[PDB]
Design a protein around this ligand. Structure first.
Ligand code: HEM
Ligand SMILES: [C-]#N
Length: 142
């Protein structure tokens, strides 16, 4: 369910997106928010009530893009290490469950990411496989 080649593509394309994430991360979040208004709703405290169409170039968005990246980098650096991946997922799940966030909203974010990553050489099928592996760890904890 997760080949060596898929992992390699995810790592390498993540390196490319990560290098560009100071501009690309805000764009990914806007794609996420435009596809899933309920995802944007959970950020209404961070963005202090602001409308979606205003948030891209805020300091909060720059911080959030950094937060998201740091965890995806940790996952993608450990794709042969189920135990390390589980440990990171457990923390992530607990934090997002405590916000009232569902497993399906996390899955939506992974689906938006998998397509977004096509611009960085990503194989959407590889990002789908990695997301499926992570969701299998996450779901029991949501
Ligand atoms: C799959 C992807 C995701 C990754 C990698 C990701 C990662 C992170 C990390 C590392 C943090 C900072 C640690 C913490 O407080 O938990 C964070 C914070 C947060 N995430 Fe996520 N997250 C994901 C999906 C989502 C989704 C789908 C939502 C909303 C429906 C969301 C809502 C939030 C909120 C509201 C914060 C706190 C913002 C704040 O400081 O006020 N996350 N996420
Ligand atoms: C969470 N971003």
């Amino acid at each position: 369910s997760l080949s060596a080649a898929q992992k390699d593509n995810v790592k390498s394309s993540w390196a490319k997106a990560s290098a560009a994430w100071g501009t690309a991360g805000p764009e990914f979040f806007m794609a996420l928010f435009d596809a899933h208004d309920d995802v944007f709703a959970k950020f209404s405290g961070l963005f202090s009530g602001a409308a979606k169409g205003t948030v891209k170039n805020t300091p909060e968005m720059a911080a959030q893009a950094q937060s998201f990246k740091g965890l995806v980098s940790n996952w993608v650096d450990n794709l042969d290490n189920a135990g390390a991946l589980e440990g990171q997922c457990k923390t992530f799940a607990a934090n997002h469950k405590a916000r009232g966030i569902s497993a399906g909203q996390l899955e939506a974010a992974f689906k938006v990411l998998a397509g977004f990553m096509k611009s960085y050489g990503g194989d959407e099928g590889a990002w789908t496989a990695v997301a499926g592996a992570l969701m299998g760890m996450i779901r029991p904890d949501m």
